[PDB]
Paper text:
Class Ia ribonucleotide reductases (RNRs) are allosterically regulated by ATP and dATP to maintain the appropriate deoxyribonucleotide levels inside the cell for DNA biosynthesis and repair. The α2 subunit houses the active site and the allosteric sites, and the β2 subunit houses the di-iron-tyrosyl radical cofactor.3−6 On every round of turnover, these subunits come together to form an active α2β2 complex, which allows for the transfer of the radical species from β to α, affording ribonucleoside diphosphate reduction. Excess dATP inhibits RNR through the creation of an α–β interface that restricts the ability of β2 to obtain a position that is capable of radical transfer. ATP breaks the α–β interface, freeing β2 and restoring enzyme activity.
We find two molecules of ATP bound to the cone domain. The first binding site for ATP is the same activity site to which dATP binds (site 1). The second site (site 2) is generated through a series of conformational changes afforded by the binding of the first ATP molecule. The presence of the 2′-hydroxyl group results in a slight adjustment upward of the ribose ring of ATP compared to the ribose in dATP due to the packing of the ribose against I22 of helix 1. This subtle shift of the ribose results in the loss of a hydrogen bond between the ribose 3′-hydroxyl group and H59, whose side chain flips 90° and now hydrogen bonds to a water molecule. The second nucleotide-binding site (site 2) is directly adjacent to site 1 within the cone domain, sandwiched between helices 1 and 4. The phosphate groups of the two ATP molecules create an octahedral coordination environment around a central Mg2+ ion. The site 2 ATP ribose makes hydrogen-bonding interactions with the backbone carbonyl of F87 through O2′ and O3′, suggesting specificity at this site for ribonucleotides. F87 movement creates the binding pocket for the ribose of the second ATP molecule and W28 movement creates a cavity for the base of the second ATP. Our α2-ATP structure shows three ATP molecules per α in total: one ATP in the specificity site and two ATP molecules in the activity site. Consequently, helix 2 has an extra turn in the α2-(ATP)2 structure than it does in the dATP-inactivated α4β4 structure.
Residue numbers in the entry:
A (entry chain A): 4 to 736
B (entry chain B): 5 to 736
């Protein structure tokens, strides 16, 4: 007897059968889901005159609430109901319009870029429409759909109106990235790429998902800036930061060159007032376009362990101290090499220098370990040179102490970053990383914001979904698609700063990683902690790097190698399999399955389109679209619960039904050794670095406190197996 | 029984030797006891004591005896300290020949070689004859300590003193007039040397310490206007960093930056607020500083009607969190007639983001009539984003924060442009400097090296009103001061193109006064009862007239400044035409000089400098002349300041004869008398004045200064045309 209100404002007798019919549609093919249960929970919330839209939101939430381990398929029931609603919001009906008509409408509204209509004829759009399978919208999980609705689908940010659906996003991202291709291969490339992303084999970054097809050209999310030891450079660095955080890019700042407090300037006309005031200026630059502090501008700043002010720098994040000696809203990366670790093991001292007082020492720190030790010991014995001694154990302990309590004091092993690298350290050394410590690229300081002699490193990201591929040879096709799409994006996107354009156009660096690694391991019955996954990992990441290189090599044949290819180790016939940390042989015996020697000569002859290709990023948001486990990290639980604006979102690990015992949750792990070994094995093939976490449960330790001995042990274990960087330290509460 | 000589030789102590030294210093002094000093000194002697330490002992002994009862101890101590400095620098009392000194110092790298290129040995012999080294005996003890500490060329490592005061004076003169033709050069050098060495002209610290050395960093006063864009905010930030690294004070105009929530590029993004950008300017200002003692200093300016004004006014108080506080800068609130009108009428003030109100920001400075038109237009427009606040509440909040911190300043922007040397339509004054006496045109930069931007600089100096016998001496002194500072403009370096443009275009100078309190007591006048109004009028007419006359004659000789056409002076307008008419009610002193003759001469030949006068605080330079600080009344007859070398006492000039004539700061009833005097000054002053307000809570019931009184004085200042309000001093 109740009445419902239709969208037009008409009223109708309540019809539970209509709701039932919709529930039947979403429930198709699903198991262990109850339509009546959803009906039971939903109906009780109905009142006379309720909006049909509110009815729809009710049944979405009801199904979403029922997502559990016992009935994981509710994640698809809820998702599909939400898809049904999104269709209605965008098209006024379930079935999407013809592609060309949609594009024309959206260009007219100013939501799509007009160049789509310039680069493709109406007939070509008709063809592309035949590629699309809108039913692939029914394969998203509920968390995926919410991220779509929230971050990716083109919408009105004011009114909230949704203007598109997922497959239109996918097909037009494909269409844009391959628009400049010849007609002989263009639409063939579009279809193949569309299939790859819409069936979740290739995962794309947020700025691409939300931007590519729209009038924007801001797609850079990853920026690396090196600051020189001068006022002009500090200003330039600050300016560069401001422009890029205004475009929401994450920043990696190298400030290790800045001379220490008290150092003479121009021979003594003035004296340096310390690094920290300049660090503060970088922080306000990073936070310049942020309101409040929840998820604003983000940066990681890098400095060497032997820096004269290092004891002051290590404590910049802890909640104690006064405002004057604290710079809390950035993260930090301490740069370490073999000599530092040597002093630690020997229980000797570490000498601290200002880089301005030790000629050639800073450069050698990154490019030449033999020369560094020569210079370091030479300067250690010189009394004319300003210095300070600290016990290596005390210094390392202080560092790890702050890493533990804040979780955001990172490590960069700079020797590993240059002895095992795609770059010639004598010409293009790697002297820093990025915000999340997976990017490792060459940089050059600016003397002006528009200095054409400076080099700001950028990197375009993506990931392979290890859970969606049937066999490792599928990566051949996928690498071709990924590399070619990202490489085209380099020419597509805009560059607000000349030094950044130089790096991107000069080196054409890419960073392609993985997601669903944990699921991948459980699938094959392997685990993180017992070394059972070592050989599989070796096999898996050999395939990844080989096919990436093969794709970039063939891209180089077709369109030419990157302008600065000559500065790479690849150009000199060197491959990652030549320069890896030899200790890896003791923990993995999987043989090489691909013809690297044929590749070596093919790279020698034709070069690479891209200087780097692989990097393992955290990828927390993009993973949710594929319902994948996050990057290479193990899941914290079988079902994750996250509070949000639209309520509580539950997400189940892939194939929990059959793999619950096969999974190894994070806190089920004995320690960090097994994981660190896997990371080391990955790093054997990875061009750049890996966002590696360390994890600790205080409950597993006496007195409920993690001892320093263990922290130092794990640090050294990572270094032993060639791990380049260390990201988060997670401590279970 | 034995003393250790400088060579390390030893001889028997001879108290008669010390007695002889004390007699030299005591010559001409009254109420000083040599024996008193001897008694205090002798007790500290031990076997093998250094003669150097003996000298330091008798200096401190004499310094300790400085009092109201015996002020002349300030000269006894000083002369003893001078004696010591002579020995430290020359190995003997009498200085070497000037040329020999210069040659030695150039070789050591302490003096600039261009002195030897621009002057012949024979010319140095001539300059040496100008010098009277006995003028070193005319310093007070505080003056000598500032010399030793800040001015004399010395080794910063070892502490070695390399020169004496008269060499500083003669070589500052020689450098500033080095480019003059030989027909008149040494004549200018001698006249200028006499002026500074007899304390008639006071020079800024960066000039006193720098001019003769290899440096060219002499700018201490910088005004930068920030545009509403990322490029400009970056440019401004870079410029700030560069200038604070040269220890310049900064005035930042950030009022153009749009408010939090404003759309960007039509809604592609939304503004995240002014405050994060203010924080970025602060870290730029403090970028070359360690600790919070002194270091980088800046004042930031914004209009009262800015949409975020309520958030901006409280950026300094000690409460609140780090997120809504930017505490290490000072702020200047910009106000005009309409705001005050709304206050009096008890009406509302509407708050706008300058990005939402076309032409409103420009009119705020240049056109009050047009401002009122646009303001009321936008107030009635409902499509335009806005906020209403009670005028009483807004003014009270401002004054509340001004009182508790003392560092929230006021700029009356209409007074700064209706009574100004600049055409507001072409070159408006939209900000001030760190200490709020400077009022010059600016133009925002789109890059640190933007050659189209304009950063305002100003070169400072002051007349010592206590050292002049009559106001006609200012003719000579103005000629010397104006020519010296104008020469410095071509002498100094410019780290930023935009700064050079302003300096070369307008050649703006800021010359003020010191010893004003002493000057009033000398003439038997006081601050608070209006008895000094006409004297003040007479005095500052002479200052401005002779400054203009000097600059006008320099224009005949060397040409008017390139951008002279942007001045009101170019259109035949004088300060006496545009002053706040209310001044007629509090001063009836007639004009004593031929302003109409000057008017026609300025129309014909122009001015070398767009501005000439500005009244700065002048706390350090005042001590050299033993002058009272600027226009401010002294807080006591004897100031006590603790330092590394002990407690330094300084007596007001001629306390002996004028103790009853002085009017100390807290002997004052209120602010009315002083604000009237500042207003009368402002009639003739080109730029502005660092006017302080003072309050003694003891003089008020409940021990609290009421808001009605704060507003009362605020409106009193506005009534008499006062352009800016600097510090509020609240007695402890
Ligand atoms: N008369 C009704 N009684 C109960 N539920 C209804 C009724 N009409 C629609 N619904 C339900 O409301 C939800 C939203 O439906 P829908 O978006 O189609 O709105 P609508 O009011 O039917 O407008 P339209 O005319 O555009 O179809 C669906 O779950 C649908 O089954
Ligand atoms: N064939 C279909 N398969 C899946 N979802 C569909 C289909 N047809 C419609 N939907 C979705 O189901 C919801 C309701 O659609 P529809 O308007 O046809 O039914 P109804 O509202 O219950 O009845 P009616 O509007 O005709 O009174 C909408 O969200 C729509 O997008
Ligand atoms: N006045 C200053 N106060 C504090 N730090 C300063 C100052 N000037 C420069 N610095 C810092 O000291 C270093 C000097 O570098 P800079 O290039 O700007 O000066 P320079 O004239 O080239 O002298 P140098 O020969 O010492 O490099 C930089 O780290 C800069 O940040
Ligand atoms: N024998 C002495 N007994 C007491 N005081 C002395 C004696 N000799 C010097 N003095 C005092 O020591 C102070 C410093 O004198 P001065 O600089 O001349 O040192 P000095 O040892 O005499 O060196 P020089 O040989 O260069 O003259 C003066 O006040 C001087 O009167
Ligand atoms: N004629 C003078 N007038 C003023 N001060 C003088 C004079 N001659 C020297 N002085 C200063 O007085 C102090 C003492 O001078 P001086 O060295 O001649 O005497 P002394 O040290 O007491 O005796 P001695 O010849 O044994 O060194 C020094 O600081 C010196 O610069
Ligand atoms: N991404 C951003 N986040 C926050 N504030 C920003 C951002 N971009 C610019 N701003 C601020 O917005 C204002 C305008 O920026 P700017 O002039 O540089 O950009 P624009 O492209 O010219 O846009 P507009 O046409 O709105 O001026 C300035 O105050 C600037 O600081
Ligand atoms: Mg319907
Ligand atoms: Mg330098
Ligand atoms: Mg002697
Ligand atoms: Mg703009």
């Amino acid at each position: 007897n109740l009445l419902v209100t239709k969208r037009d404002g008409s009223t109708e007798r309540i019809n539970l059968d209509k709701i039932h019919r919709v529930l039947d549609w979403a429930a198709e093919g699903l198991h262990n889901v109850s339509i009546s249960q959803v009906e039971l929970r939903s109906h009780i919330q109905f009142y006379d005159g309720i909006k049909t839209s509110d009815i729809h939101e009710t049944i979405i939430k009801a199904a979403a609430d029922l997502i559990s381990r016992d009935a994981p398929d509710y994640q698809y029931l809820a998702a599909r109901l939400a898809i049904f609603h999104l269709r209605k919001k965008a098209y006024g009906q379930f079935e999407p319009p013809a592609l060309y008509d949609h594009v024309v409408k959206m260009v007219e509204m100013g939501k799509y870029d007009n160049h789509l209509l310039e680069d493709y004829t109406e007939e070509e759009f008709k063809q592309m429409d035949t590629f699309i399978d809108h039913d692939r919208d029914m394969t998203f999980s509920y968390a995926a759909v919410k991220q779509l609705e929230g971050k990716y689908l083109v919408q009105n940010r004011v009114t909230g109106e949704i203007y598109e659906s997922a497959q239109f996003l996918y097909i037009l991202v494909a269409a844009c990235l391959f628009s400049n291709y010849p007609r002989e291969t263009r639409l063939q490339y579009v279809k193949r790429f569309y299939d790859a992303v819409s069936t979740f084999k290739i995962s794309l970054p947020t700025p691409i998902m939300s931007g590519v097809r729209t009038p924007t050209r801001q797609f850079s999310s990853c920026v690396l800036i090196e600051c020189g030891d001068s006022l002009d450079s500090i200003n330039a660095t600050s300016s560069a930061i401001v422009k890029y955080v205004s475009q929401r890019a994450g920043i990696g700042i190298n400030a290790g060159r800045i001379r220490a407090l008290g150092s003479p300037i121009r021979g003594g006309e003035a004296f340096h007032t310390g690094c920290i005031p300049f660090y503060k200026h970088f922080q306000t630059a990073v936070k310049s376009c942020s309101q409040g502090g929840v998820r604003g501008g983000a940066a990681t700043l890098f400095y060497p362990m032997w820096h004269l002010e290092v004891e002051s720098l290590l404590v910049l994040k802890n909640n104690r101290g006064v405002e004057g000696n604290r710079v809390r809203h950035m993260d930090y990366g301490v740069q370490i090499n073999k000599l530092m670790y040597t002093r630690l093991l020997k229980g000797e001292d570490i000498t601290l220098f200002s880089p301005s007082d030790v000629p050639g020492l800073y450069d050698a720190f990154f490019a030449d370990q033999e020369e560094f030790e020569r210079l370091y010991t030479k300067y250690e014995k010189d009394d004319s040179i300003r210095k300070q001694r600290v016990k290596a154990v005390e210094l390392f302990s202080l560092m790890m102490q702050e890493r533990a309590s804040t979780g955001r004091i990172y490590i960069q092993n700079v020797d590993h970053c240059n002895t095992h690298s795609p770059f010639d350290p004598a010409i293009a050394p790697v002297r820093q990383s990025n915000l999340c410590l997976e990017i490792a690229l060459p940089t050059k300081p600016l003397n002006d914001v528009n200095d054409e002699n400076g080099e700001i490193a950028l990197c375009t990201l993506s990931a392979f979904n290890l859970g969606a591929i049937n066999n490792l040879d599928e990566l051949e096709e996928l690498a071709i698609l990924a590399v070619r799409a990202l490489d085209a994006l380099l020419d597509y996107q805009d560059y607000p700063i000349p030094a950044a354009k130089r790096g991107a156009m000069g080196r054409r660096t890419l960073g392609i990683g993985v997601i669903n690694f944990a699921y991948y391991l459980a699938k094959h019955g392997k685990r993180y902690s017992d070394g059972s996954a070592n050989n599989l990992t070796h096999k898996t990441f050999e395939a990844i790097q080989y096919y990436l290189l093969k794709a970039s090599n063939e891209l180089a044949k077709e369109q030419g190698a990157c302008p600065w290819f000559n500065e790479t180790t690849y150009a000199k016939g060197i491959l990652p399999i030549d320069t890896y940390k030899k200790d890896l042989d003791t923990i993995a015996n999987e043989p090489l399955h691909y013809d690297w020697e044929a590749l070596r000569e093919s790279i020698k002859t034709h070069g690479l389109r891209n200087s780097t290709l692989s990097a393992l990023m955290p990828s927390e948001t993009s993973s949710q679209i594929s319902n994948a486990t996050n990057g290479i990290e193990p899941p914290r639980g079988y079902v994750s619960i996250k509070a949000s604006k639209d309520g509580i979102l539950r997400q189940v690990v892939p194939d929990y039904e059959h793999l619950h015992d096969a999974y190894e949750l994070l806190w089920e792990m004995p320690g960090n050794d097994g994981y660190l070994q896997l990371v080391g094995i990955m790093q054997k093939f990875i061009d750049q670095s890996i966002s590696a976490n360390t994890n600790y449960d205080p409950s597993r330790f006496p007195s409920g406190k993690v001892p320093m001995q263990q922290l130092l042990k794990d640090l050294l274990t990572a270094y032993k197996f060639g791990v380049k960087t260390l990201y988060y330290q997670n401590t279970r509460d």
